Amino acid sequence: PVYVDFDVPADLEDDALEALEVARDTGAVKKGTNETTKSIERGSAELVFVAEDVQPEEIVMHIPELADEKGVPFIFVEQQDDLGHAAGLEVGSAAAAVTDAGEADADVEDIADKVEELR
RNA sequence: GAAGCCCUCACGGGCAAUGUGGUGUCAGGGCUACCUCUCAUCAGCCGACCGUCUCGACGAAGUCUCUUGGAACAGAGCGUG
Ligand SMILES: [Sr+2]
């Protein structure tokens, strides 16, 4: 919330998770706020996901600004266990990063586009 | 970066990406490229001697004479470990 500056429509979110699912099956993705963070710092990230129901908020407060000063696109997901499920985890995930998609690049690209537009 | 842990004989359940587990800890460490090598450390297995404290077994040689005395464990005499 304090780190959320725009609401992502349920639909856009639907597509993103799908792109992430096919991303892990095809391309490469990182699970966990620590791995996600290093990807953004190493620049090996194309699209980063960040849950909104993370408590405490400190765990992910840094993602937004760290991404902007890295050109890396990011998007918000409502639930925390969905991001984890979509990332292929048996638990939750406060953040995720698509480290080079796979057969989803087109979509991942559009999702990012739709985001910049959503300001 | 799930390669992990806990419960249950098992089935199975729970924990764990808000990080279980590997690596590492100033002889700094990690990483990339090499040399060599390990007996350091850490984990686990086995597992005492001796010493000390207490407890217990075994364990030598007179119950001889006289006198006194209620009693010899006394005095004098002879004998023993
Ligand atoms: Sr959870």
A52, A43 Cβ separation under 8 angstroms: no
For A8, the enclosing helix (H) or strand (E) is none
Distance CA A73, CA A97 (A): 10
Gyration radius from chain A CA atoms: 12
Closest nt to residue A60, judged CA to C1': B18
Q: Give the CA-to-C1' distance from A51 to B27 in angstroms.
A: 46
Distance CA A36, CA A2 (A): 20
- DSSP letters of A12-73? HHHHHHHHHHHHHHSS-EEESHHHHHHHHHHT--SEEEEES--SSTHHHHTHHHHHHTTT--
Q: Which nucleotides of B are covered by protein (CB under 7 A)?
A: 1-2, 15-19
Helix (H, G, I), strand (E, B) or coil at A96: strand
Q: How far is CA A61 from CA A8, A37, A43, A56, A75, in A?
A: 17, 11, 19, 9, 13
In CATH, what class is A1-119? alpha beta
Q: How far is the CA of A93 from the centre of ligand 1 (A)?
A: 8
Q: How far is the CA of A74 from the centre of ligand 1 (A)?
A: 22
A17, A81 Cβ separation under 8 angstroms: no
Q: How far is CA A28 from CA A47, A60, A113, in A?
A: 11, 21, 20
Which protein residues have Cβ within 7 A of any strand B atom?
A: A 31-36, 53-56, 59, 80, 84, 87, 89-95
Distance CA A90, CA A109 (A): 27
Reported resolution, Å = 2.2
Vertex A62: Cα angle to A70 and A44 (nearest 5)? 35
Q: Is A32 left (phi over 0), alpha (psi -120 to 50) or beta?
A: left
How is residue A99 written in tokens?
């480290």
- Is the alpha carbon torsion for A71, A4, A107, A93 positive or negative? positive
